[PDB]
Amino acid sequence: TYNITGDGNSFTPTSDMTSTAAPAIDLKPGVLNPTGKLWRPVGTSVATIDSLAIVSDRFGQYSFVNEGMRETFSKALFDINMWQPLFQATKTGCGPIVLSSFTTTTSGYVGATAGDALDNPVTNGVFISTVQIMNLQRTIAARMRDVALWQKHLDTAMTMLTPDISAGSASCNWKSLLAFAKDILPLDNLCLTYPNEFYNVAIHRYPALKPGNPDTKLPDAQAHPLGEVAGAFNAATSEVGSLVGSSSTLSQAISTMAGKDLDLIEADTPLPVSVFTPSLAPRSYRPAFIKPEDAKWIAEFNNSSLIRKTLTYSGATYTVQLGPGPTRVIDMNAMIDSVLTLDVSGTILPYDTNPDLSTSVPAFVLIQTSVPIQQVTTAANITAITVVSAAGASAINLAINVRGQPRFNMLHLQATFERETITGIPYIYGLGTFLIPSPTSSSNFSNPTLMDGLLTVTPVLLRETTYKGEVVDAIVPATVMANQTSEEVASALANDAIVLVSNHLNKLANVVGDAIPVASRTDDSATSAIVSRLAVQHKLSQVGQASPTPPDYPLLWRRAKRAASMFVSNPSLALQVGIPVLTQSGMLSALTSGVGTALRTGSLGKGVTDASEKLRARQSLTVAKQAFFDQIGSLWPGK
Amino acid sequence: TYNITGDGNSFTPTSDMTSTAAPAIDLKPGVLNPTGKLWRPVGTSVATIDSLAIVSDRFGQYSFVNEGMRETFSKALFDINMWQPLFQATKTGCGPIVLSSFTTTTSGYVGATAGDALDNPVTNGVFISTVQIMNLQRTIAARMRDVALWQKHLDTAMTMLTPDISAGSASCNWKSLLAFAKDILPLDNLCLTYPNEFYNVAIHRYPALKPGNPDTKLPDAQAHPLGEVAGAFNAATSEVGSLVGSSSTLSQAISTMAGKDLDLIEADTPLPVSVFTPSLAPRSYRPAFIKPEDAKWIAEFNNSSLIRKTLTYSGATYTVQLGPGPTRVIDMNAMIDSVLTLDVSGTILPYDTNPDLSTSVPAFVLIQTSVPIQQVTTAANITAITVVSAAGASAINLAINVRGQPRFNMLHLQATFERETITGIPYIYGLGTFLIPSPTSSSNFSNPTLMDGLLTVTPVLLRETTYKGEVVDAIVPATVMANQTSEEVASALANDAIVLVSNHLNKLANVVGDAIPVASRTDDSATSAIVSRLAVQHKLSQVGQASPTPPDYPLLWRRAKRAASMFVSNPSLALQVGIPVLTQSGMLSALTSGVGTALRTGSLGKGVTDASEKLRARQSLTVAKQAFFDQIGSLWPGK
């Protein structure tokens, strides 16, 4: 080792030399194997081939060692080796392990099963023991936990004036840098106790950095350790940013395609719930101004009838007062299994002018009658009015009443909508209302009722997702197409085909944006899948002079970017009625499939625009870094 | 190693087997040496004997190694070895050092100085290098700091049901113990992760304990490791408790005698201050009812004179009112150097009935006149009344006045009594008083003054301790004898012979009580020193029939225990006038000297009484421990 406090030392951070170490390694189970355990012909001579017993698992002779695992593991040991002089100095069992010693001869048969192994004998290879690996690992782990302080400290240095030029090249007086470091750095650092080691290590890791003055002749070199190799791959090229990058990126896209299993979209006729549906969340709907026409599970009673005074409790009365748009009728007649999470706040609106101000609560009432709502004109009809959701059913001024306001405190109501509880038959309804025991003046409070907040359906039963009111074991995307208005979608239960499809469709979009250059106005060949479907579809031929469409290739191509772009910008549009060309499921199937091939055999898409731009920005960054260092040079021209 | 969770394992704590390890070793500088550094005859052949150069300190060849240090150090290494299987398992550089490897050949001349070394050549011995010891130590330290958690954990076990029978022998089901341990012990312990190791170690340290079931045949043994040896010396014998004990104890007594240097007491004619005096502390005296006759530095003015109105401040007046026992006159006329730390609390006693209640403070006034106090009858006399000690010299009701009380808050006054400030000549006095600016009615407040609290003399000048007012470079113990009343002693300045002597005398006493059996009525031959002086002194012969004293040996012997006992019970009595036989300094010299011989060649004094008693108590302890374990056996009969 060399005196760190010398002259000649380069501070050359380059893109070429992008910091790297070995942070973590691959340890996937799958990856652990290669492969065959070693066996023997009973134990007697060359006869018993029919029979094998495993070698001495007892304390040694195990399987044929994982070529990759050996190679990997040895590498790992080299990390520690990077700090050998320091370990040694710390007296912390430094002695380089030599993995090879552990990898001991195994001689006989190679195979996974006795079966297979019978056939194959492999003389004088190598095994490793459970015990041995135990103790080997033990060591490595220990080594790591000994370095855990060091690593941190090393890192701090490396950031406290960061030697990282990710793009191109920077240079400044290392001396200058170094001395300001030691003028600014916290005394309590390990770096200040161990300058010499840390720097040595740094130099050994960062080819970007050179030793002090060791031979001021030659402080600098071009050959450093292994590092280099890995660095070249992170360094920006003529046509691409990062090779690893784009490769990874694309591979993540694939694997998400993989997991979606594509096919998903091309489903007319029953595709099973379980298969299509992942994980589901609650949704929030309103009474208020929802639309009875559109909303399957939530409609309204109609103006004109008047069911005013109904007994609500023991000799206690409330006017439900049924007429002009009385909140909403929640149609929970076999509408899967949910929890009617009613979230009332704001809305109280005190009775007109009744001293029934006290004792009036926000409530939920289910109505349980074989008399369809439009028939329900008198008390007789009702069968069952069951007040379900009120809890302490009196009242207190929870409304922010001080300043005139009739804001009602946030309540959480629950109605366990389990259709099994009733099992249909007296078809299931529910209403929302400020229900009282203390009798309300019907003549006075002419309003039926105006309990208008939130209704957060909790679709508990992730079992069996609904296709448009139809409680089915089927999710059929392609037929969902063009059969949904925005209103309908919004209205729809959480448990419904539509949202599920969009969730899947959002992953397709994700892929497309990141991988395919459908960014600011770049029409790419990639987009060809949709156009090919469009092109053939447009064969509107009549008699004589058919459709005189100057070939599809400009025309439809541009139209098709436009509509792709609309898909991308909002995925739900796919499900939304009246969308020019996406209404044709063919084109969506075409896109879906299309992409995968496009990833597959795509010659790594690097947008010309973006390249230049990244180049430029990168350069300017470097400039300002230079200028920073310069300022640092100025303020403490370290030696 | 053996399964700990087996049968056959003994739980036999014995006196014989008193836990021990190697907690710390001797590393006294003195002790580091042995000895001669190794040198060479310049470097040429056998001619240059006249000249030596030290061998290669450079990186190796140093001194002849410390025989003791080698032996010691190797032992130390063995501590770590006690945990070798565990170290190894922890992967913590376990590999047993082998000190011997470090101890490398040195061949040539042996000596301390070139001088000495010239004469002595010692071929092919051994050295150790600075560097080497550096790195060796480093290892050992590291080892220790690795075990620091283990040690603790081991200890906890060993106390959580303590296997320590210091006296005799105990036995109980180890199984029982063990299982209750593991049923009660904290999960977070290292003991519960490492059962097998800890137990092994335990067994290796504690011969008192046997392995589980290793061969249930033979789980038990009588040969354990080295331990044993050390244990036998801590084990109680037929005539003594502990051999180490009594040996140590006595040696501590000697060395305190050593440090006192005996001679101290036998000093008539000037023995130098510095020599006799160690470290000194402040003392606390009262005005109040101290006695002018006895108290050198603190006397009183005498009733009848009346110096009432004296100007105290700028056109502001206080009646010092000098007559009937006015506090005290502190005679600080060349009475060494002190800080007159006046500690007033309680005492305020408001003016008789003057609206001069406000503006009256507890103060100190020094009086600086060549007119001796008894001559001081009018204002003219005073020369100087200097109000020294008041600080904010007005007043506030600091007295706990609410409940009628006239308790004055605790004040801290200071008068830097540096006799150099004045250098005698206008002889130095001081008084204590509630001094006012706001004029006090002399006719009214007829009392002179009653400022009676504490006066804590701070004898700052540990230079030159006073013998009875006489500021001398001499401390003469033997002449102090019989020239001090209890009053005088109490009165005496901190800086005075008397207390110093007692402090020394207290160490003699300490020795005597711990070592010599001058406890509950045991007259021992040891006491013979005093009697032999007594015996010869009693030679009261006249004419004819001289003193018919039935020989000294019962008579004087008993009288002399009595008076020894009185000395022991209070050391100061030695300095106190009128003590029958101790008044003779001869006897104190005799005791002083006497003791040392008595320690020296005493056949290790173990009082018969105490032996039996210790035996008995010890046994009964063991009994109840047995009974405890028994209860533990009961509550969880572990396997």
Taking an 8 Å cut-off on Cβ atoms, the answer to whether B139 and A91 are in contact is yes
Interface membership of B94 toward A (CB under 8 Å)? yes
Under DSSP, is residue B179 helix (H, G, I), strand (E, B) or coil? helix
Query: Which residues of B fall within a CB distance of 8 Å from A142?
Result: 90-92
CA closest to B136 among chain A residues: A91
The residue whose two tokens read 């160490």 is: B507
Question: What does the alpha-carbon distance between residue B187 and residue A405 come to, in Å, rounded to a whole number?
Answer: 59
Tell me whether the omega of the peptide bond preceding residue A353 falls within 30 degrees of 0, making it cis.
no
* Alpha-carbon span A275 to B190, nearest angstrom: 49
Q: Which residues on B lie below 8 Å from A95 (Cβ)?
A: 93
Contact B142 A93 (CB under 8 A): no
Q: Give the whole-angstrom CA distance, residue B541 versus residue B544.
A: 9
Contacts of B138 in chain A (CB under 8 A): 91
Report which DSSP code applies to B16. G
Q: If you search the block for the tokens 């156009």, which residue do you land on? A: A531
Whole-angstrom CA distances from B368 to A461, B311, B312, B334, B421 are: 105, 16, 15, 13, 12
The beta-carbon neighbor of A91 closest among B89, B90, B142 is B142
Chain B within 8 Å of A94 (Cβ-Cβ)?
Answer: yes
Nearest residue of chain A to residue B94 (CA atoms) = A93
Contact between residue A491 and residue A295 where contact means Cβ atoms under 8 Å apart: yes
Omega before A458 cis (within 30°)?
no
Task: Of B546, B562, B336, give the one whose Cα is nearest residue B457.
Answer: B336
Contact B495, B279 (CB under 8 A): no
Contact of B626 with B170, CB cutoff 8 Å: yes
Distance to chain B for A91, nearest Cα, Å: 6
> What backbone torsions phi and psi does residue A581 show, to the nearest 5 degrees?
-105, -20
Residue A144: CB partners within 8 Å, gap ≥ 6? none
Residue-wise DSSP of A54-93: E--TTTS--S---HHHHHHHHHHHHHHHTTHHHHHHTTS-
DSSP of A501-547, one letter per residue?
A: HHHHHHHHHHHHHHHS--STT---GGGHHHHHHHHHHT----SSS--
**Neighbouring C-beta atoms of residue B336, cutoff 10 Å:** 24
* Cβ-contact A427, A336 below 8 angstroms: no
Alpha-helix runs per DSSP H in B538-580: 552-569
User: Which runs of consecutive H residues, i.e. helices, occur in B219-344?
Assistant: 228-234, 243-260, 273-276
Question: CB B92 to CB A92 under 8 A?
Answer: yes
Chain A residues closer than 8 Å to B94 by CB: 93
The span from the CA of A580 to the CA of A560, in Å, is 10
Model resolution, angstroms: 4.5
Question: Phi and psi for A320 in degrees, rounded to 5?
Answer: -70, -20
Angle at A615 between CA A614 and CA A620, to 5 degrees: 100
Cα distances (angstroms) measured from residue A493 to each of A337, A421, A484, B251, B629 = 11, 20, 13, 94, 70
Contact between B44 and B166 under an 8 Å Cβ cutoff? The reply is: no
* Shortest CA gap B140–chain A (Å): 10
Q: Among candidates A493, A386, A366, which has minimal Cα distance to A428? A: A366
H/E element, B364: strand B361-368
Kind of pairing between the strands at B454-458 and B283-285: antiparallel
B92/A94 touch (CB, cutoff 8 Å), yes or no: no
Are B44 and B163 within 8 A, CB to CB? no
Q: Are A498 and A296 in contact (CB under 8 A)?
A: no
Q: Do A142 and B91 lie within an 8 Å CB cutoff?
A: yes
Say how many C-beta atoms besides its own lie within 10 A of residue A284's C-beta. 11
For residues B373, B378, B383, B388, the Cα torsion angle rounded to the nearest 10 degrees is: 80
For residues A318 and A393, what is the distance between their CA atoms, to the nearest angstrom?
12
Q: Rounded to the nearest 5°, which phi and psi values hold at A110?
A: -110, 110
The dihedral sign for the CA sequence B401, B404, B406, B408:
negative
DSSP state of A239: S
Rounded distance between C-alpha atoms, residue A339 and residue A525, angstroms = 49
Q: Are B330 and B297 in contact (CB under 8 A)?
A: yes
Q: Which 8-27 residues of chain A touch chain B by CB within 8 A? A: none
Nearest to B636 by CA among B171, B209, B185, B181: B181
B92–chain A Cβ distance below 8 A for any pair: yes
- From chain A, the residues in CB contact with B86 under 8 A are none
Tokens of A340: 């009617």
Measure the CA–CA gap between A229 and A222, rounded to whole angstroms: 13
The DSSP code sequence of A541-578 is --SSS------HHHHHHHHHHHHHHHHHH-GGGGTSS-
- Measured in degrees and rounded to the nearest 5, phi and psi for residue A448 equal -60, -75
Residue of A nearest to B140 (CA): A91
Residue of chain B whose alpha carbon sits nearest to that of A146: B92
Q: Which residues from B are below 8 Å from A93, CB to CB?
A: 91-94
CB A367 within 8 A of CB A433: no
Q: What is the residue whose two structure tokens read 């007491």? A: B265
- The two three-digit tokens of residue A465, written as one number: 């997702």
Amino acid at B426: P
Instruction: Choose among B91, B138, B139: nearest Cβ to A139.
Output: B91
- Interface test mutation site (partner B, options A80, A84, A91, max chain B beta carbons within 10 A): A91
Give the residue from chain A lying closest to B87, CA to CA: A93
SS3 B42: coil
Token pair 């720097």 in the structure block, residue? A199
Using the Cβ of B93 and the Cβ atoms of chain A, whether some distance falls under 8 Å is answered with yes
Residue B339 CB coordination number (10 Å): 17
Is the distance from CB of A475 to CB of A503 less than 8 angstroms? no
Q: Is B132 on the interface with A (CB under 8 A)?
A: no
Q: Which two tokens stand for residue B416?
A: 């830097």
* Chain B, window 176-195: residues with a beta carbon less than 8 angstroms from a chain A beta carbon: none
Interface of A with B in 140-179 (CB under 8 A): 142
∠ CA B413-B415-B419 to the nearest 5 degrees? 165
CA B79 to chain centre: 33
- Residue matched to tokens 């960061």: A162
Q: How many residues does chain A have?
A: 639
CA distance B257 to chain A (A): 47
Nearest chain A CA: its distance from B85 CA (Å): 13
Sequence-ordered alpha helix ranges (H) in B261-383? 273-276
DSSP labels, B240-252:
-S-HHHHHHHHHH
The CA angle B363-B365-B370, to the nearest 5 degrees, is 170
Q: To the nearest 10°, the Cα dihedral for A106, A108, A112, A117? A: 180
Breaks (C-N over 2.5 A) in chain A follow: none
Structural contact between residues B515 and B527, judged by C-beta atoms closer than 8 angstroms: no
State the virtual CA torsion across A502, A508, A514, A520 in degrees, nearest 10: -70
CA angle A90, A96, A100 (to 5 degrees): 165
| CB atoms A138 and B91 under 8 Å | yes
Chain B hits for A92, CB-CB cut-off 8 Å, are 92-93, 142
Which H or E run includes A340? Answer: strand A339-347
Q: Give the chain B residue nearest A141 (alpha carbons).
A: B91
**Which residues does chain B have within 8 Å of residue A139's beta carbon, measured at their own beta carbons?**
91
Q: Which residue has the tokens 């000098």?
A: B322
SS3 B168: coil
Number of continuous H segments (helices) and E segments (strands) in chain B? 19, 15
Beta strands in B245-338 (DSSP E): 283-285, 298-299, 307-313, 316-322, 329-330
Angle between helices B608-635 and B174-184 (to 10 degrees): 70
Least Cα distance to B6 among B175, B242, B142 occurs for: B175
Q: What tokens does B25 get?
A: 């070793």
For residue B142, the chain A residues in CB contact (below 8 A) are: 91-92
Do the bridges between strand B454-458 and strand B385-389 make them parallel or antiparallel, or are there none, so unpaired?
Answer: unpaired
Residue identified by tokens 């056949």 is: B603
- Work out the number of other CB atoms within 10 angstroms of the CB of residue B479: 15
Q: Write down the H helix ranges in B170-210.
A: 174-184, 190-193, 195-205
Write the Ramachandran bin of A424: left for phi over 0, alpha for psi from -120 to 50, otherwise beta. left
Residue A244 to chain B, least CA–CA distance (Å): 37
Q: Residue A589, Cβ neighbours under 10 Å: how many?
A: 18
